[PDB]
Design a binder for this molecule. Structure first.
Ligand SMILES: Nc1ncnc2c1ncn2[C@@H]1O[C@H](COP(=O)(O)OP(=O)(O)CP(=O)(O)O)[C@@H](O)[C@H]1O
Ligand SMILES: O=P(O)(O)O[C@H]1[C@H](O)[C@@H](O)[C@H](OP(=O)(O)O)[C@@H](OP(=O)(O)O)[C@H]1O
Ligand SMILES: [Mg+2]
Ligand SMILES: [Mg+2]
Length: 311
């Protein structure tokens, strides 16, 4: 039997994702011959599956994608417009995690300051909390965060947004990348533990963590400033999370399976933290068709996609 897989990615994503690339590649896996094509444009001939990350929620690619899906219903998308749309909403992601009993820090999708005030006044939302845009993917603004340390810190929040209780997690985050059942994981630095010293809020873009160098004195412990200032608070690789006693392989596989089932996604990245590095994983982010840690082997990627396709 033969299966055609078509990888549809712009050069920008091809460059960040792959060490190198190939046009024609054919291989056999589990008694099936896979023909894999990579292009920046949609296929002229209908394949069995299209493997794609939609660069932006709106625009030409998004439009082409929706049209193609409608007009070629037999083509499997990894991942579809519908999955990208859901994964572009922090509300929709967290609703599915909650519905599927996957621990997260306490989270509220809010539309207004009045709503935030009521959540604070009723002791539902506990300080400090991080404010994440409702839009989750495809822009610089999607990653523009505020940490609210005191009630007065709510004044300049951009709505709609997710307000999520801030967990002091000792500046370690576990990243689990999935190609279906195939996993890759790592630990990175994250954000420092924060202190409620009187400062009302601080801001950072997750793509520009050097913002943290400018936070007022007292929010971060002096020793944490010493330990992280040399790399400008950048997202730095740490030791393997099992070796660090943060998690186990079985825990990561269980969590990743639960998230994939909850969200109906095969190609994703899951970020989780633990309060004081102990207890339940707390999922803080799920991303469609992620970085996989950057610069991955092309042949590895396509074989694992083929494996996923069979399953
Ligand atoms: N509830 C929480 N408590 C403490 N820190 C949190 C947190 N939620 C997120 N963080 C920190 O903020 C960072 C950015 O949050 P998040 O991962 O949700 O945004 P994002 O979707 O912009 C990241 P990506 O670039 O991986 O998509 C995380 O990497 C983590 O360091
Ligand atoms: O895999 P991690 O380390 O979690 O980071 C990814 C983010 O999670 C994605 O949201 C990025 O996509 P966008 O820049 O389109 O939002 C994505 O950008 P990319 O698709 O260009 O690689 C990555 O930065
Ligand atoms: Mg993240
Ligand atoms: Mg994200």
């Amino acid at each position: 039997q033969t299966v055609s897989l078509f990888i549809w990615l712009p050069e920008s994503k091809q460059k960040t994702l792959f060490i190198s690339t190939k046009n024609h590649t054919q291989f056999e896996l589990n008694n099936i011959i896979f023909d894999v094509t990579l292009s920046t444009e949609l296929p002229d001939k209908e394949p069995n599956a299209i493997i794609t990350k939609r660069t932006h929620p709106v625009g030409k690619m998004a439009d082409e994608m929706r049209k193609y899906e409608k007009d070629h219903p037999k083509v499997l998308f990894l991942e579809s417009s519908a999955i990208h749309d859901m994964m572009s909403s922090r509300e929709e992601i967290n609703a599915l995690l909650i519905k599927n009993n996957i621990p997260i820090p306490n989270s509220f999708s809010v539309k207004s300051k009045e709503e935030v005030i009521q959540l604070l006044q009723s002791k539902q939302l506990i300080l400090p909390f991080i404010v994440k845009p409702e839009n989750a993917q495809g822009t610089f603004n999607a990653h523009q965060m505020k940490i609210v340390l005191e009630q007065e810190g709510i004044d300049d929040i951009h709505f709609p947004c997710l307000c999520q209780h801030y967990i002091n997690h000792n500046n370690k985050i576990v990243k689990v990348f999935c190609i279906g059942n195939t996993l890759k994981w790592q630990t990175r630095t994250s954000l420092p533990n924060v202190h409620r010293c009187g400062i009302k809020s601080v801001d950072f873009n997750n793509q520009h963590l050097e913002d943290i160098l400018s936070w007022p004195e007292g929010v971060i412990d002096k020793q944490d400033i010493i330990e992280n200032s040399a790399n400008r608070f950048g997202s730095k690789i740490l030791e393997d999370p099992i070796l660090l006693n943060l998690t186990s392989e079985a825990e990561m596989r269980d969590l990743a399976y639960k998230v994939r089932c909850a969200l109906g996604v095969q190609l994703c990245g899951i970020d989780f933290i633990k309060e004081n590095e102990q207890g339940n994983p707390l999922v803080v982010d799920v991303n469609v068709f992620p970085s996989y840690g950057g610069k991955v082997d092309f042949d590895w990627f396509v074989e694992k996609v083929a494996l996923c396709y069979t399953e």
